[PDB]
Swiss-Prot record:
PANTHER family: FATTY ACID BINDING PROTEIN
Role noted for this protein: Intracellular transport of retinol.
Name the record gives this protein: Retinol-binding protein 2
Tissue distribution of the protein: Higher expression in adult small intestine and to a much lesser extent in fetal kidney.
GO MF annotations in UniProt: fatty acid binding; molecular carrier activity; retinal binding; retinoid binding; retinol binding
Family: Belongs to the calycin superfamily. Fatty-acid binding protein (FABP) family.
Gene: RBP2
Taxon lineage: Eukaryota, Metazoa, Chordata, Craniata, Vertebrata
Organism: Homo sapiens (Human)
Length: 133
């Protein structure tokens, strides 16, 4: 299934600190951020997505259309300019962000009642699991 709609509460977070290090996030931010539980809110209608990632420490929102490239500034995360593109590989939603960092982007897919996420940058992969609230 491609239905990623919902409010998703984190269950598991693996190697988030490694992914942040690959993005060059400063020590202070990483040490706080790695402690925190995350929430993902996805609104999905056809190709049109609104995605919000939140903790007590950050709020990161992005809107996009599947299949349409968009220039984006990564704002409070690492303040970099990338060219982003989100597409379907089967029922895996795949984002590639072209720019200074290699292998940058993410993957999201559904397994039963849970949403699985990969965050990639450089040679780092962060693996996450969320349950549907
Ligand atoms: C689909 C998942 C996305 C877009 C994100 C998951 C964590 C993100 C993030 C942004 C800023 C600061 C920390 C984490 S975005």
């Amino acid at each position: 299934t491609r239905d990623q709609n919902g409010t998703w509460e984190m269950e598991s977070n693996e190697n988030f600190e490694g992914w942040m290090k690959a993005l060059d996030i400063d020590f202070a931010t990483r040490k706080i951020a790695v402690r925190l539980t995350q929430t993902l809110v996805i609104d999905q209608d056809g190709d049109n997505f609104k995605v919000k990632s939140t903790s007590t420490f950050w709020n990161y929102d992005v809107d996009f259309t599947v299949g349409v490239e968009f220039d984006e500034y990564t704002k409070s995360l690492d303040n970099r300019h990338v060219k982003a593109l989100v597409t379907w590989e089967g029922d895996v939603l795949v984002c590639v962000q072209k720019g200074e960092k290699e292998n940058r982007g993410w993957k999201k897919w559904i397994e039963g009642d849970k949403l699985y996420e990969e965050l990639t940058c450089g040679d780092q992969v962060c693996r996450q699991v969320f349950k549907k609230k």
